[PDB]
Amino acid sequence: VLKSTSANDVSVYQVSGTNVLEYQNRVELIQDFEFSEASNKIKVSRDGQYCMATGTYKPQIHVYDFANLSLKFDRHTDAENVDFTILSWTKSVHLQNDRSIQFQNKGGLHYTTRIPKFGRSLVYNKVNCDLYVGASGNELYRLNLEKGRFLNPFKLDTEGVNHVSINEVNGLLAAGTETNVVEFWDPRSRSRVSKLYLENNIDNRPFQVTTTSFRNDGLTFACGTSNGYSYIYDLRTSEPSIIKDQGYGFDIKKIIWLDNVGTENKIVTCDKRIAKIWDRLDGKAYASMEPSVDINDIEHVPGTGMFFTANESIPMHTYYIPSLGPSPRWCSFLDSIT
Amino acid sequence: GISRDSRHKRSATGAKRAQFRKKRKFELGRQPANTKIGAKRIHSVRTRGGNKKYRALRIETGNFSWASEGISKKTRIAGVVYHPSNNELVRTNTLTKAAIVQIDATPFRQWFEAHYGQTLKIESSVESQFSAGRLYACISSRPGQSGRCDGYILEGEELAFYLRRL
Amino acid sequence: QSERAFQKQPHIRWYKNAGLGFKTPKTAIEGSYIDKKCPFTGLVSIRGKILTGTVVSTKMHRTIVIRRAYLHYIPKYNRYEKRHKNVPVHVSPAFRVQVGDIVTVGQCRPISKTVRFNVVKVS
Amino acid sequence: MKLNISYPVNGSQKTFEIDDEHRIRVFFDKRIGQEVDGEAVGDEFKGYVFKISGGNDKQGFPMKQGVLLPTRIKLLLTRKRKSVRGAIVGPDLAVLALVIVKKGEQELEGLTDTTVPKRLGPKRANNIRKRLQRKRHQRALKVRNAQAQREAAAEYAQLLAKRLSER
Amino acid sequence: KGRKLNYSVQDPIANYEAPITSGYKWSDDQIDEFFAG
Amino acid sequence: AAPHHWLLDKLSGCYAPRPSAGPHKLRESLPLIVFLRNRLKYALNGREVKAILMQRHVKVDGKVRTDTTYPAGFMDVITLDATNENFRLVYDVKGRFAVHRITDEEASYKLGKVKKVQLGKKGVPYVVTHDGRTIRYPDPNIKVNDTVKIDLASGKITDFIKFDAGKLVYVTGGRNLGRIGTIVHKERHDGGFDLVHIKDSLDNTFVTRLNNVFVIGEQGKPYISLPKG
RNA sequence: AUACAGUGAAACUGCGAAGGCUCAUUAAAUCAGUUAUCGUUUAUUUGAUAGUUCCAUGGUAUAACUGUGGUAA
RNA sequence: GAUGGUAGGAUAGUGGCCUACCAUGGUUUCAACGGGUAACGGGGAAUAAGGGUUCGAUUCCGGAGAGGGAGCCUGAGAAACG
Known part of the structure; x- marks a missing residue:
């Protein structure tokens, strides 16, 4: 029975923590989950297995098979990564800290291309297949996987963009800039539709929006900042918002929904040290997930109540919530041990 | 990294038809470890016999040197504002050689009050940081090769030499 | 004389001497020029061999393109076809070398992809 | 089973x-x-x-x-x-x-x-419970090594001093 | 600006993926009557 | 598969003995197997030259150094205990290793060209030679290409021969390899073909390098004895 | 030779193998010599080369080994 | 990256070897760059033979490969015939 941290009348558990008789009652879930002293970015594929965790020094790819509970390989890529996506299964696209883009396959490293300026984010379009890559400046580029061309790059404002995302059920391209404007483009028209401005009441310094998200209803939009302040948005009276100051507030990097499992209207926010979870329409914290080290980013596995972080320590932490949901079919005795 | 050879590229004459060779062991380009701020973790890599190389990634305890007396004392790291060997490197806030990074200068306050008595001859635009706490200082040591963060403080001429820039 | 960042300075105003029959001008001993790769103050040390010839182009800065015609005793068609050679070379604070200007250079420590020679003399 | x-x-x-x-x-x-x-x-x-x-x-x-x-x-x-x-x-x-x-x-x-x-009782001394001539010779060879080397070094440094005085 | 923004066509990505016909589960009329304002 | 310097007859074998590492280079030395076995013929094969090396008759440079492929280079005095064999081996006039026989007061020393003088660590002057005898503390006026005289009982420099115009020089290297006569000319260039030039029977002239030449004495008085014909 | 004492299957150890075939056609860029590395790595060879001490000997944890077994292996 | 400059990365270190910024350079009719084989032949690559005058001794054709590309590891030395 794994120990649980104190919270607001709710329980969470960590597996593979910094502390995790213990040697002979080990509770290790995924073997060889440890990197070279940090972690870049972890995400779980669309199907029921094959999670991918990017590397730290001699950076790797680290695909874990969930139905084998261990590592498959580690393709030591050429440069250090910041952002990537997964395109179903075996294909995936990455971009590194330099302005280069790798295409991993089953054989690995299908191509290495580049963008003219230093990039910061990448997303893929399921409809007509053009990956949009956000970079520094006036420049939000396309690499269409149909015919391998380049497209007429989207003209931005001065400094650039920290995050780009497209909406799923209808395709509304977000681009979180530096000057508080969110710069919604249309993936149909290749033109702007709106230049929504973000406001507060504290106004410490001119914050920059760093996280953008949507969900599968296509009506709301989750917004971030460089200050530790979550925001919600709708088309219904789109000028105000609801806001969420966080108790430490450095830079929120991961805001993701719970739009496919039970216990609805709930959202996860995540800044550099803490990751919390709260409810819509009130703004009150359901739980929080305080680790012993900082967080590079997180992810949430679909269908069930578990979370996978990428942090600055040697292992990665997984966080199980036995009130948000169960443990999945490949982890189907976590509810028997704890 | 990849390589160190002229065979993949053109010389001062403009030649072609390269198709040369499988690349050897001694063209070894390791990955660029952009050293950042964190908890102190140095990877001990091997090369050329027992030539251990300290590859620092998350170093903090910078030994930065008081210039006019040469007093290399221990402090922390804040962030680099200007380094146009890559203008995105200061956007991402890494820590490489010859960068100008900010330091909470509290042990330099301790040394001044310890070997001079009073608190505050030294320049005014660094006396402002003597009062406030954060002074500018440039890294000398190589954390990607020697694994260390040493540096020198900014005192007057070199201060304005960077402040007029950015 | 400071158009770039990162503390443009000598690396330990500073002054040294390679010796071996090549003078150091007084501005290159005590002057405001940095002498990063000019061998009189410099960081490089001298070695090797010393070559002499006139120039073709000095278009870019820190690029002295020497020409070097030399005699070779051809036995094939029993006449001397005339030689020509080229070598890029870094500047020195002693002479703005224009077209003509037979000068000599000493071998040291590859600076760019193709330069091992730096000017030590003008006459 | x-x-x-x-x-x-x-x-x-x-x-x-x-x-x-x-x-x-x-x-x-x-x-x-x-x-x-x-x-x-x-x-x-x-x-x-x-x-x-x-x-x-x-x-x-x-x-x-x-x-x-x-x-x-x-x-x-x-x-x-x-x-x-x-x-x-x-x-x-x-x-x-x-x-x-x-x-x-x-x-x-x-x-x-x-x-x-069980198998057999212990073999080590501390495991049974729970040289000095070498200690003579080690110390003697160490002090003799000091009295040889650290004196001979200055004994040719004084010859350097003679060459410097004569030069 | 040499390697900066080569507007060329590249070989392995020309058929790396394949499109989808219906795509968005909404209609384009639903787009227009979604963000008229 | 052989060099020219060893005076090695061709009707010997197929594999030639590579010398092992040691004081001198590979290209300027002969090992003990090609010395004892097939030049002055104290052996007949490798087995018995290894047998006498295990018996330890050889006393090159005053130490035993029991090895078959020990690279005896220039003027290492090979000493053999039985029949008091003292052999100083120098270069002849056509490139080979002429092994002259000497006596005990001459084999009590050798000489060596100084290569570099260093302020290495902790204020210690420093000198190296072609066998690499790092001996302590010479005078400050040791230039390059002068000649120290090693003690061969301890290691100290006993005498010193200054390199200047008017000294008896030995040339080991290039197309002048192994000539004596040292005076027609002096010419120090600035990077190549720089030397002191050597006479002949009709006092002809010759060109070499600085590092390919090194001094052995004076005009008529070298304290090395030399063979004749 | 009542704490060791020779033969010695099988186990740890030191080392051994210390350089062998086929396939598509590179014009001083494959190669040979040479200059240099105070521009650099180096096992082995060789010569050299170490000065900080307040109120009789240090700890469990693994083999080989026994013993109980699984599996077609 | 064509040519160089400044700084960093990586290096065993020199190095546009790689990246940021900047300048528009550099080679060539005194042969650039490009065209092929008796490049299974040639270049001393070397031994020469007391009459064979381009037969007549050899190192090397180019780089790879351990089923196929990719990634990693070991060592004084390797992108290992193990």
């Missing part, structure tokens, strides 16, 4: 071929380290407690302590892809290993009432 049982302090171990799997079903879905009672595996051994310690299944494959997933999975061990059964015990174990840490209500003429001794 077969049950290997070990009484460690007496040094006894024996296997018992127990059929009739509703006796066996007490161990089911209990991973390695979690204890058990004698009451639901048997009646003739009541008040018994066994810490399980793994077991090879049919096809001989071992379980390593505490992973998950009581089917077989392919891990990386002492690094190559070896097949290893999960730590949780289910219906398809051939042998299952047990350590009895408390005798209950019946003596066993294999485990309790019969025992083996």
Whole structure:
């Protein structure tokens, strides 16, 4: 029975923590989950297995098979990564800290291309297949996987963009800039539709929006900042918002929904040290997930109540919530041990 | 990294038809470890016999040197504002050689009050940081090769030499 | 004389001497020029061999393109076809070398992809 | 199933071929380290407690302590892809290993009432409980090495001083 | 600006993926009557 | 598969003995197997030259150094205990290793060209030679290409021969390899063909390098004895 | 020779193998010599080369080995 | 990256070897760059033979490969015939 941290009348558990008789009652879930002293970015594929965790020094790819509970390989890529996506299964696209883009396959490293300026984010379009890559400046580029061309790059404002995302059920391209404007483009028209401005009441310094998200209803939009302040948005009276100051507030990097499992209207926010979870329409914290080290980013596995972080320590932490949901079919005795 | 050879590229004459060779062991380009701020973790890599190389990634305890007396004392790291060997490197806030990074200068306050008595001859635009706490200082040591963060403080001429820039 | 960042300075105003029959001008001993790769103050040390010839182009800065015609005793068609050679070379604070200007250079420590020679003399 | 049982302090171990799997079903879905009672595996051994310690299944494959997933999975061990059964015990174990840490209500003429001794007493001095001439010679050679080298070094440094005075 | 923004056509990505016909589960009329304002 | 310097007859074998590492280079030395076995013929094969090396008759440079492929280079005095064999081996006029026989007061020393003088660590002047005898503390006026005289009982420099115009020089290297006569000319260039030039029977002239030449004495008085014909 | 004492299957150890075939056609860029590395790595060869001490000897944890076993292996 | 400059990365270190910024350079009719084989032949690559005058001794054709590309590891030395 794994120990649980104190919270607001709710329980969470960590597996593979910094502390995790213990040697002979080990509770290790995924073997060889440890990197070279940090972690870049972890995400779980669309199907029921094959999670991918990017590397730290001699950076790797680290695909874990969930139905084998261990590592498959580690393709030591050429440069250090910041952002990537997964395109179903075996294909995936990455971009590194330099302005280069790798295409991993089953054989690995299908191509290495580049963008003219230093990039910061990448997303893929399921409809007509053009990956949009956000970079520094006036420049939000396309690499269409149909015919391998380049497209007429989207003209931005001065400094650039920290995050780009497209909406799923209808395709509304977000681009979180530096000057508080969110710069919604249309993936149909290749033109702007709106230049929504973000406001507060504290106004410490001119914050920059760093996280953008949507969900599968296509009506709301989750917004971030460089200050530790979550925001919600709708088309219904789109000028105000609801806001969420966080108790430490450095830079929120991961805001993701719970739009496919039970216990609805709930959202996860995540800044550099803490990751919390709260409810819509009130703004009150359901739980929080305080680790012993900082967080590079997180992810949430679909269908069930578990979370996978990428942090600055040697292992990665997984966080199980036995009130948000169960443990999945490949982890189907976590509810028997704890 | 990849390589160190002229065979993949053109010389001062403009030649072609390269198709040369499988690349050897001694063209070894390791990955660029952009050293950042964190908890102190140095990877001990091997090369050329027992030539251990300290590859620092998350170093903090910078030994930065008081210039006019040469007093290399221990402090922390804040962030680099200007380094146009890559203008995105200061956007991402890494820590490489010859960068100008900010330091909470509290042990330099301790040394001044310890070997001079009073608190505050030294320049005014660094006396402002003597009062406030954060002074500018440039890294000398190589954390990607020697694994260390040493540096020198900014005192007057070199201060304005960077402040007029950015 | 400071158009770039990162503390443009000598690396330990500073002054040294390679010796071996090549003078150091007084501005290159005590002057405001940095002498990063000019061998009189410099960081490089001298070695090797010393070559002499006139120039073709000095278009870019820190690029002295020497020409070097030399005699070779051809036995094939029993006449001397005339030689020509080229070598890029870094500047020195002693002479703005224009077209003509037979000068000599000493071998040291590859600076760019193709330069091992730096000017030590003008006459 | 077969049950290997070990009484460690007496040094006894024996296997018992127990059929009739509703006796066996007490161990089911209990991973390695979690204890058990004698009451639901048997009646003739009541008040018994066994810490399980793994077991090879049919096809001989071992379980390593505490992973998950009581089917077989392919891990990386002492690094190559070896097949290893999960730590949780289910219906398809051939042998299952047990350590009895408390005798209950019946003596066993294999485990309790019969025992083996140990191997042999200790060999080291501190293990039996729980040179000086070399100490002479080491110190003497060390002070002689000092009185040779650190005097000879200055003895040719003074010859450098003679060359410098004459130069 | 040499390697900066080569507007060329590249070989392995020309058929790396394949499009989808219906795509968005909404209609384009639903787009227009979604963000008229 | 042989060099020219060893005076090695061709009707010997197929594999030639590579010398092992040691004081001198590979290209300027002869090992003990090609010395003893097939030049002055104290052996007949490798087995018995290894047998006498295990018996330890050889006393090159005053130490035993029992090895078959030990690279005896220039003027290492090979000393053999039985029949008091003292052999100083120098270069002849056509490139080979002429092994002259000397006596005990001459084999009590050798000489060596100085290569570099260093302020290495902790204020210690420093000198190396072609066998690499790092001996302590010479005078400050040791230039390059001068000649120290090693003690061969301890290692100290006993005498010193200054390199200047008017000194008796030995040339080991290039197309002048192994000539004596040292005076027609002096010419120090600035990077190549720089030397002191050597006479002949009709006092002809010759060109070499600085590092390919090294001094052995004076005009008529070298304290090395030399063979004749 | 009542704490060791020779033969010695099988195990740890030191080392051994210390350089072998086929396939598509590179014009001083494959090659040979040479200059240099105070521009650099180096096992082995060789010569050299170490000065900080307040109120009789340090700890469990693994083998080989026994013993209980699984699996067609 | 064509040519160089400044700084960093990586290096065993020199090095546009790689990246940021900047300048528009550099080779060539005194043969750039490009065209092929008796490049299974040639270049001393070397031994020469007391009459064979381009037969007549050899190192090397180019780089790879251990089923196929990819990634990693070991060592004084490797992108290992193990």
